[PDB]
Scaffold this motif. Structure first.
Motif, PDB file in Angstrom:
ATOM      1  N   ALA A  72       0.582   6.702  -8.736  1.00  0.00           N
ATOM      2  CA  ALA A  72       0.333   7.890  -7.938  1.00  0.00           C
ATOM      3  C   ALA A  72      -1.149   8.247  -8.026  1.00  0.00           C
ATOM      4  O   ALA A  72      -1.733   8.106  -9.105  1.00  0.00           O
ATOM      5  N   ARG A  73      -1.726   8.715  -6.921  1.00  0.00           N
ATOM      6  CA  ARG A  73      -3.076   9.297  -7.055  1.00  0.00           C
ATOM      7  C   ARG A  73      -2.878  10.761  -7.583  1.00  0.00           C
ATOM      8  O   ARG A  73      -2.327  11.662  -6.891  1.00  0.00           O
ATOM      9  N   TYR A  74      -3.364  10.987  -8.791  1.00  0.00           N
ATOM     10  CA  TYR A  74      -3.485  12.366  -9.308  1.00  0.00           C
ATOM     11  C   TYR A  74      -4.882  12.917  -9.029  1.00  0.00           C
ATOM     12  O   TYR A  74      -5.849  12.270  -9.479  1.00  0.00           O
ATOM     13  N   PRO A  75      -4.934  13.990  -8.203  1.00  0.00           N
ATOM     14  CA  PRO A  75      -6.256  14.631  -7.967  1.00  0.00           C
ATOM     15  C   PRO A  75      -6.928  14.917  -9.323  1.00  0.00           C
ATOM     16  O   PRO A  75      -6.260  15.188 -10.373  1.00  0.00           O
ATOM     17  N   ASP A  76      -8.261  14.822  -9.365  1.00  0.00           N
ATOM     18  CA  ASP A  76      -8.954  15.187 -10.600  1.00  0.00           C
ATOM     19  C   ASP A  76      -8.507  16.526 -11.194  1.00  0.00           C
ATOM     20  O   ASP A  76      -8.409  16.632 -12.383  1.00  0.00           O
ATOM     21  N   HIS A  77      -8.283  17.541 -10.369  1.00  0.00           N
ATOM     22  CA  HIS A  77      -7.868  18.886 -10.859  1.00  0.00           C
ATOM     23  C   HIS A  77      -6.463  18.931 -11.500  1.00  0.00           C
ATOM     24  O   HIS A  77      -6.101  19.918 -12.141  1.00  0.00           O
ATOM     25  N   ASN A 146      12.094   7.217   5.168  1.00  0.00           N
ATOM     26  CA  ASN A 146      11.466   8.528   5.455  1.00  0.00           C
ATOM     27  C   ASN A 146      10.471   8.975   4.332  1.00  0.00           C
ATOM     28  O   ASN A 146      10.540   8.415   3.233  1.00  0.00           O
ATOM     29  N   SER A 147       9.527   9.898   4.628  1.00  0.00           N
ATOM     30  CA  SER A 147       8.614  10.427   3.569  1.00  0.00           C
ATOM     31  C   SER A 147       9.274  11.610   2.945  1.00  0.00           C
ATOM     32  O   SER A 147      10.000  12.375   3.613  1.00  0.00           O
ATOM     33  N   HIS A 148       9.067  11.706   1.648  1.00  0.00           N
ATOM     34  CA  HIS A 148       9.853  12.624   0.826  1.00  0.00           C
ATOM     35  C   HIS A 148       8.930  13.138  -0.298  1.00  0.00           C
ATOM     36  O   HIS A 148       8.160  12.362  -0.819  1.00  0.00           O
ATOM     37  N   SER A 202       4.037  13.271  -3.395  1.00  0.00           N
ATOM     38  CA  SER A 202       4.363  13.046  -1.955  1.00  0.00           C
ATOM     39  C   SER A 202       4.370  11.549  -1.786  1.00  0.00           C
ATOM     40  O   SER A 202       3.439  10.892  -2.108  1.00  0.00           O
ATOM     41  N   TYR A 203       5.463  11.068  -1.222  1.00  0.00           N
ATOM     42  CA  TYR A 203       5.647   9.668  -0.961  1.00  0.00           C
ATOM     43  C   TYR A 203       5.814   9.345   0.522  1.00  0.00           C
ATOM     44  O   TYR A 203       6.456  10.096   1.254  1.00  0.00           O
ATOM     45  N   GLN A 204       5.206   8.239   0.931  1.00  0.00           N
ATOM     46  CA  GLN A 204       5.446   7.618   2.209  1.00  0.00           C
ATOM     47  C   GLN A 204       5.637   6.120   1.939  1.00  0.00           C
ATOM     48  O   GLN A 204       4.901   5.500   1.158  1.00  0.00           O
ATOM     49  N   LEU A 221       5.157  -1.068   1.478  1.00  0.00           N
ATOM     50  CA  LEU A 221       3.771  -0.513   1.400  1.00  0.00           C
ATOM     51  C   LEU A 221       4.039   0.988   1.076  1.00  0.00           C
ATOM     52  O   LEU A 221       4.881   1.613   1.755  1.00  0.00           O
ATOM     53  N   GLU A 222       3.469   1.547   0.003  1.00  0.00           N
ATOM     54  CA  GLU A 222       3.824   2.929  -0.387  1.00  0.00           C
ATOM     55  C   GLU A 222       2.466   3.630  -0.629  1.00  0.00           C
ATOM     56  O   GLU A 222       1.519   3.002  -1.159  1.00  0.00           O
ATOM     57  N   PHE A 223       2.400   4.905  -0.244  1.00  0.00           N
ATOM     58  CA  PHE A 223       1.281   5.797  -0.610  1.00  0.00           C
ATOM     59  C   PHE A 223       1.864   6.992  -1.326  1.00  0.00           C
ATOM     60  O   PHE A 223       2.834   7.600  -0.850  1.00  0.00           O
TER      61      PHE A 223
END
Length: 230
Positions: A72-77, A146-148, A202-204, A221-223
């Motif tokens: 997962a991308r965790y925002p720096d904050h 679906n995105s979830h 958040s997943y897509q 392919l997942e973001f």
């Protein structure tokens, strides 16, 4: 932060990924191998899976969630909220029950850890109480996804986290097959881990096929990006 440095430092570039799954749904046995790569800086994962035993007895979409939250991308904050990376390299166990509405259930146990430079996801899946000719064993689910949001909270008792979310899989007749996910993760090692505040991922996901591939397979392919702590 010298901690959000270590586990986190293992994910700053492209990381090779191996996934291995041993499965048994209502006695229908199957194995899947997957390979790809993850780039947590962008929350990106690209994977291809092959049923190595022959025909997959359940729909490929039903296995998406089972087949890597450390990417997962965790925002720096929010980097203090990233349990999955903090548990690396020794890794974490991810257990689920997946309740298919008006159908059976999957129970999975996975170990996610480094083997050398490769991040590995080793899974045992057992499914029981499925209908023969239901949406899952009767293959009535569409090849899409679906995105979830996925909701994360601390489970201080198991020194880990609990996760809960619902996936709606689109059925061929236009309706939806709900899959209710209950999840727990705990570190394999004894070292300190981050216990997050409530937040979500958040997943897509996008499913496709390799036009050269004649085995039963799925390209995924997942973001994924962490949020919900402003």
């Amino acid at each position: 932060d010298p901690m959000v440095s270590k586990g986190e430092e293992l994910f700053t570039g492209v990381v090779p990924i191996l996934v291995e799954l041993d499965g048994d749904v209502n006695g229908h046995k199957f194995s899947v191998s997957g390979e790809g790569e993850g780039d947590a800086t962008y929350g990106k994962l690209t994977l291809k899976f092959i049923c190595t035993t022959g025909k997959l007895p359940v729909p490929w979409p039903t296995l998406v969630t089972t087949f890597l939250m450390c990417f997962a991308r965790y925002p720096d904050h929010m980097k203090q909220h990233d349990f999955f990376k903090s548990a690396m390299p020794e890794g974490y166990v991810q257990e689920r029950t997946i309740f298919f509405k008006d159908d059976g259930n999957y129970k999975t146990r996975a170990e996610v850890k480094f083997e050398g430079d490769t991040l590995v996801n080793r899974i045992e899946l057992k499914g029981i109480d499925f209908k023969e000719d239901g949406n899952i064993l009767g293959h009535k689910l569409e090849y899409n996804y679906n995105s979830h949001n996925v909701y994360i909270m601390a489970d201080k008792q198991k020194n880990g986290i609990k996760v809960n979310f619902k996936i709606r899989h689109n059925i061929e007749d236009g309706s939806v097959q709900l899959a209710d996910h209950y999840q727990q993760n705990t570190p394999i090692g004894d070292g300190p881990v981050l216990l997050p505040d409530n937040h979500y991922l958040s997943y897509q996901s996008a499913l496709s096929k390799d036009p050269n591939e004649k085995r039963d397979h799925m390209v995924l392919l997942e973001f994924v990006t962490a949020a919900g702590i402003t």
